[PDB]
Design a binder for this molecule. Sequence first.
Ligand code: SNL
Length: 530
Amino acid sequence: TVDDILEQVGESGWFQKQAFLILCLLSAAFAPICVGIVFLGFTPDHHCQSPGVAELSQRCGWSPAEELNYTVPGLGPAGEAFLGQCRRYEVDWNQSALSCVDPLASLATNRSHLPLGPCQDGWVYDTPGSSIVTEFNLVCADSWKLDLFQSCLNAGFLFGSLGVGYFADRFGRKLCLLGTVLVNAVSGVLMAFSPNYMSMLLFRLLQGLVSKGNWMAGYTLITEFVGSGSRRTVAIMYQMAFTVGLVALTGLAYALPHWRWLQLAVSLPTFLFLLYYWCVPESPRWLLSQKRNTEAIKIMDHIAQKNGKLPPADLKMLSLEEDVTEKLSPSFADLFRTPRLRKRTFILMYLWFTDSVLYQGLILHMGATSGNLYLDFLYSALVEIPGAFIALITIDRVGRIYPMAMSNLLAGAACLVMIFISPDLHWLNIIIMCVGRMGITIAIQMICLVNAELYPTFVRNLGVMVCSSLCDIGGIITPFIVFRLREVWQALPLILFAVLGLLAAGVTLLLPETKGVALPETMKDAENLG
Ligand SMILES: CC(=O)S[C@@H]1CC2=CC(=O)CC[C@]2(C)[C@H]2CC[C@@]3(C)[C@@H](CC[C@@]34CCC(=O)O4)[C@H]12
C-alpha cells in the first residue's frame, strides 16, 4: 500500500529531484575509489639514476632528448624495456667522455661489453607531477605492488560488502550512510597523508570495506523511495552520476598533476554530503518492515509538507498488509530457503561474476589507443552514455529480462567477432570493442536494477551484497586469468569471454520478469515474482 500513498502524495516530485541529486552525489564520489588508480598510479617514463650522467649533461649543456638517448642503455625498448628502465651503466660517467655528443666509447655497441647493473641511486621520472610509483619507486622490481592497490580494494569490497550489507539491513539505510560516509571520508583524508605504502594499503582496504556498501545502500534507498514507474528513470540515471564523476575525476586529474592534491579534491564531495546529510529521510518500506509505523507516517507527512500537496485521509495507519512481527530476519540462509529463491540467487551470483569478468576483460584487452591518458579515460568513460540511454528507452518498452539477455548475447558475439578480426583495419576493431562495452554496460545496469528488484525489502541490501560478492572475486582473478591464458594461447581469453557471455545470455532468461511490478515487501511477495 506504500505505492498507493506515494501516488496520492505525488511521486517524482521536487523533493524527489532534491533527494535524487543528493543521493546521486555518492555515485559521483564513488568513481575515484574504484578507478582512481588510473590517475593516482599512472606510470611515467623512467630510467636508472646515474650521478655521472648529470655531470656530463651540465658540462655540455645537452638537451634531454639526446641526453636520455645516450644515458639509458635500452634506447630501443623492444616491448619489455628492461634494458632501459631497469639497467644502469656500471661504467662511470663522471669522467670526461671521448665525445659528449652521444658517447659510445665503452664498446662497439657500448652495451654488449659494458656491464649493466640495477638501479642504485633511485629513479627519475619524465613528468611535471607525481604519482604512487613516482613517490614510492614502484616501476622496475616493485611494479607488482601497484596491482596490490586494486587487490586490497577488491578484497575490502568483498568483506565490507557483506558486512555493510548486513549492517544496512539491520540498522537501516540512514545509519549505514552515516557510518560508511564517515569511514570513507576518514580513509581518503589519511590516504592523502600516508607516509608509507603499507598505510595506504590498509586505508585502501578500509575504503573497499565501506565504499561499495555506501554506494549501493544509497542506490537501494533511491530505488525504494520512488514508485513502480519511476524505478527505471531513477536507477539508470543514478549511474549518470558515476559517469559525471568519471568526467570530473578526469578534469581534476588534468588540473592537479600531483596525486595528493587529487585525493584532497576527490575527498571533498563526501564531506559536503556530510554537511548536507539531514535532507534525506529513511526508506518508508524498511520502516514498515520494522513495525515502525508512526515514523513512516511522519516521513509521509514531511514529504507531503515539502511537496506542497496536502496528505490524504488514508495516509494515517500506514501499515503492512500482513504484519505479524518485527520482520527483522536478514539471514544468509534466507536467500536459499526456497528452491526458486536459491535458483535466482545462484543465477544472479553467476551473472554478476560473468559481467564483472567480461567488463574487466573488455577494459584490459584494448589499451593500445594512443594519445593522452586523460583523453583515453574520457573515451572509455563517455561510451557508457548511449548504451544507458538505449536502456532508459528500452526497459519500459520491452522489460528487464530480454534487454539483459540480448546485451549479454551481443557482448559474447563481440568477443567472438574480434578474435577472427584481423589486426589490420583497426577502426573496425575499435568499433567492435565499443559495441561490446556498450552491451556490457547495458547488462550491468540491467542486473543492477534486477538484483534490487527481485528481493524483499528486509533482505534487499544483504541479498544484493551476497549476489554482488562475485563481482569482486571476478575483479581479483580476471587479470591473472587473462595473463596466464594469454601466455598459453594468443586468443584463449577471448574464447572464454565468448563462452561466458553466451552462457550468461542463456542463463538470464530463467529470471522472473519484473516489469511494472511493485517491490516485494513480505516473504511471500518475492516468491510470487515473475
Ligand atoms: C568497475 C566495476 O567492476 S563495476 C563498477 C563498480 C561496482 C562494483 C559492484 O560490485 C557494485 C556495482 C558497481 C558500483 C558498478 C555499478 C554500475 C557502473 C557504475 C559500474 C561502472 C559503470 C556502470 C555500468 C555502466 C554505467 O552507467 O555505470 C560499477
